[PDB]
Design a protein that fits this description.
Two copies of one chain form a homodimer.
Chain A (H helix, E strand, L loop, with lengths): L8 H5 L7 E6 L10 E6 L7 E7 L12 H6 L3 E6 L8 H17 L7 E11 L1 H12 L5 E5 L15 E6 L11 H7 L6 E6 L12 H15 L6 H4 L9 E6 L7
Parallel strand pairs in A: 3-4, 3-5, 5-6, 6-7, 7-8
Antiparallel strand pairs in A: 1-2, 2-4, 8-9
Chain lengths: 259, 257
Amino acid sequence: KVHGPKPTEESITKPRGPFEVNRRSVSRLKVKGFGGGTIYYPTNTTDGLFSAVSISPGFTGTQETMAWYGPRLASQGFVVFTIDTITTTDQPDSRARQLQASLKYLVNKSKVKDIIDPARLGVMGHSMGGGGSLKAALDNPKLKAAIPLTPWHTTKDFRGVRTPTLIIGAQNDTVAPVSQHAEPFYKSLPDKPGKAYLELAGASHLAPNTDNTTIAKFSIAWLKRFLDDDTRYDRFLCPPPRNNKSISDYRSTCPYKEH
Amino acid sequence: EPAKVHGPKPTEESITKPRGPFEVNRRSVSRLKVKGFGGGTIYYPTDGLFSAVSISPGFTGTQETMAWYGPRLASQGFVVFTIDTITTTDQPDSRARQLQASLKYLVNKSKVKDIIDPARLGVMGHSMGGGGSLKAALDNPKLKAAIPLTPWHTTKDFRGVRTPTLIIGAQNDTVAPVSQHAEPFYKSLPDKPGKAYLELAGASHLAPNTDNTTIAKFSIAWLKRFLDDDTRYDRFLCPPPRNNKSISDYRSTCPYK
């Protein structure tokens, strides 16, 4: 149950995949467990069901900070929900619950509920939202993928996360320094079902908030591989990338075996 | 993988006695012989296998604060490890890892490993150690029971804990006030596989550090029911207790099926 043609380096790095994207706003006034958001979804709803991902911003951030992920990922055959939080000062564990509440809304109530495979749901988030994604995955092992972007959390040990997790760090991050956040998070994760750490060379904490080919490629491959079980994307992930000036460090538990 | 039926069919009397039916022996584990925790004392019964439970102290506390659980529980047919932490100021999430390290030592390396059922492992702990027990269960869903005693943690949301959990609070606790620690922890836990909250009437934060018939009865019933799958002890837990002057509040997801 896969979408799109056989991928190439060229296809996965293009700003848009093969799907046209529609959007629907969800008002803060119409939902309770999070702050509303924007749903980006493939206009072609006549084929198979799609996997879905919710994406959280960080502290003081709104969905505007994450908007680029909407078209970039939805155009690859996903439903993508860029959420706002109840308040912009919500902490990571609250962000976790808001991510889960947003997925519940998407599958139970939203206008696109019947185009989503409710068994194939992921989380992503920036900064405290990335901390939130780790805790959301810890608390719901049914989640099939997590992508914490320059994550920040006071909890450091995520050994209980059973979800395939790609942590994206920023080498020169001073807000969530990788030695204190991304790296301990990654090292704590179990060997299986699959993890990776991708560190963006020369990047700062805000790198996730603007179109980034490296973030896009690896996030598309991760969601394809783990939400869709699409092994045609394994080639992008394993063996780990080499000779990439954008990537200052990479760690993995390649190969990732279907079990 | 069959359940255990250690000891005689229980009664109110049998479960409230300080010393249960099994003879207790004890072995020290040196701090200098382990790395993942601070050593401890293993209490174990005198041709079957027994479930095992590790027990953490709280902040600035040593195993002496939890020593009474060793005989009281081991005499009911359990291997009980009262651990020390690497330092007395270790934080809850570190205490979680030390509880898990202590269990791994028990099953892989200890002098009592031949009598332990490695499939049936639980955690308990006081205060920060009770926060630790919640995090240990969050992180290892194979654990079959958790008993956080007057727990303290900064993390409040344990909805990801898949282990049967009995939280014991103290009504008048000012260190880990129930409204800020035990109650939010309990409410966050999932409905299944089974949870309970027992609040000790008039009790302070230090209630868990002295022989307490209520703590003992409910802890024995919980470990029997969930580490051993010994449903002969269901009767003590469900329906919830009533008319008990020692219990100022009780919450459950009875029945536990």
